[PDB]
Amino acid sequence: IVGGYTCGANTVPYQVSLNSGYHFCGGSLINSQWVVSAAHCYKSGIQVRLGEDNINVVEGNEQFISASKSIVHPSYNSNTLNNDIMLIKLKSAASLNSRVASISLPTSCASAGTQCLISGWGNTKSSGTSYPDVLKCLKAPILSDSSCKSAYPGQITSNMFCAGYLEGGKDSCQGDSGGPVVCSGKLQGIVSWGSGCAQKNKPGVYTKVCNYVSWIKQTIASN
Amino acid sequence: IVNGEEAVPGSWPWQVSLQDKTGFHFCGGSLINENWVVTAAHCGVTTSDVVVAGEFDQGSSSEKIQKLKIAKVFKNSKYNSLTINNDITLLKLSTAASFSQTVSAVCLPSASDDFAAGTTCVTTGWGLTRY
Amino acid sequence: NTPDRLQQASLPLLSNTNCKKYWGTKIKDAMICAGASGVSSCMGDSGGPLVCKKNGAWTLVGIVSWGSSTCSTSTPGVYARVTALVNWVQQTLAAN
């Protein structure tokens, strides 16, 4: 997250870190057994780390649970990032308390202008690299589809939306992928991609989770 | 408007430009009928200002525009200049606008009308396109 | 950049609750927010229309009023809420 703020320990209790010996993506806890992340974060042997604040320090509220299943959307297109969603089943149920909690899925698509919370442990710099220890947060609006398409002509599918700041300076960035865009208490987005981070006219692009609620239900129900 | 787009000329016929006596645009307005424009109270419209209807291109001197004198400004008395609440003023025109393809009225809602959150609406104007 | 040519933007109405996420207590009942969507009303737009369709007809829902000091397209523009003011409009027209 560029241009964000330190969330505060466990204030984003659905945020998880996907770890394969290092933090490589985020994700969002959607119930005790399941995490939503981005399909481009798919890899074997994911360990989901819940209740993290400082991802480089054992602080005592962590739950590390291995992925038992990492189910990429079956129409995921790694070239355009269309359907960039994945569900990760935890090998064991996470212990849900104040510091580890699921986030609700949308019951409807959020409208543009709605303010969201995007969080993660990604790069905090728009040029160069600085990875935070603690979870960073950014309030960002959903941008209208027309703004999003204007920013990224030919690249914005119906399964994507932009959120952030056309003026630049605030965005999600590498290491945030897979993580949450939460708007009025619903997971509307998954950190997906962008042209750089926090660049003028290049807002982050997010997987439109509201399009996937049935698929998520179905995948959960089927696994 | 930042990150808007140029309107089809004449396609927002109620949009007026509030100009000073020199033609300097300082606020917009909307015609709600031939004789009245509704604008923001904070714009500080006075009867020295003029309502220009029918403009598309303020850089053009060749549009059929109407420069309409303001007979009377009715600032909403509830307007709070510090909080900008109740930010409306009516301008009664000295002479009726002549409605035409490019000049006509916007509809006024009823007080009970629900324009739901999420509704895509449109704003128009000659404000800055880039801050 | 000021434009010679009339501009327009489509933008979503925000709930006063959503708008308050940005503007907090500044948002009054006679205000309605729109935008925070990649467009913004900006200086010189004030007083102009925020219009929505009501049964095919464009209806003045807002009057450009105020918002981001930098016209940030990620902050809602705040518009005078015409439904809250239209009674006054009608009464002024009636009396005049």
Binding site: - | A7, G10, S11, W12, S104, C107 | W58
Partner: peptide, 11 residues
Amino acid sequence: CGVPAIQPVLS
């Protein structure tokens, strides 16, 4: 009212 003679075209 509210129905422009010249229809707005919005992107």
